[PDB]
Design a protein around this ligand. Structure first.
Ligand SMILES: [Cl-]
Ligand SMILES: [Cl-]
Length: 152
RNA sequence: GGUGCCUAAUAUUUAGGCACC
């Protein structure tokens, strides 16, 4: 198992559960726009959360789509970041749980969920490679080692 | 077979399409 392999095996695993990582720049700006919509306790359907993040993301990142942002929203939902108000005959509304209404706390949950998908897929990826994959630098290895230890 | 993307749904997930290998 070389790195170019583990990275393509990691991203395919992620997309297999209907989730997505748009690269370290765009994913960071995607999460922030999710926080911009939700940090005040506003309650948005998937559809309105997607339109909000897509429309603001588009001018800097033209590849942003309802599908690609749906997949990022699915990653947060799969990480159990949302309070979901279920009503009859209507779309469920999503709020950010009180504990995940800041970027640091939301991002930790996001990183953790990608690591659980690596483990579900039997992928064994060291922290230097994690730092690279999620942040595009080597400045997050400890962060990553912290999430790996919690999950084991 | 496999990947990638697009469209749709109240999705801890589905369903459909195209492209490429
Ligand atoms: Cl409400
Ligand atoms: Cl809450």
């Amino acid at each position: 198992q070389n790195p170019q392999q583990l990275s393509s095996n990691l991203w395919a695993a992620v997309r297999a559960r209907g989730c997505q990582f748009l690269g370290p720049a765009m994913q960071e700006e995607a999460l922030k726009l999710v926080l911009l919509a939700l940090e005040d306790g506003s309650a948005l359907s998937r559809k309105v959360l997607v339109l909000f993040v897509v429309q603001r993301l588009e001018p800097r990142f033209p590849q942003a789509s309802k599908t690609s942002i749906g997949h990022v929203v699915q990653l947060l939902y799969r990480a159990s970041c949302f309070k979901v108000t279920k009503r009859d005959e209507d779309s469920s509304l999503m709020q950010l749980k009180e504990e995940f209404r800041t970027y640091e706390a939301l991002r930790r949950e996001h990183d953790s969920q990608i690591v659980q998908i690596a483990m579900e897929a039997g992928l064994r990826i060291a922290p230097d490679q994690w730092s690279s994959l999620l942040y595009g630098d080597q400045s997050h290895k400890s962060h990553m080692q912290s999430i790996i230890d919690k999950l084991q």
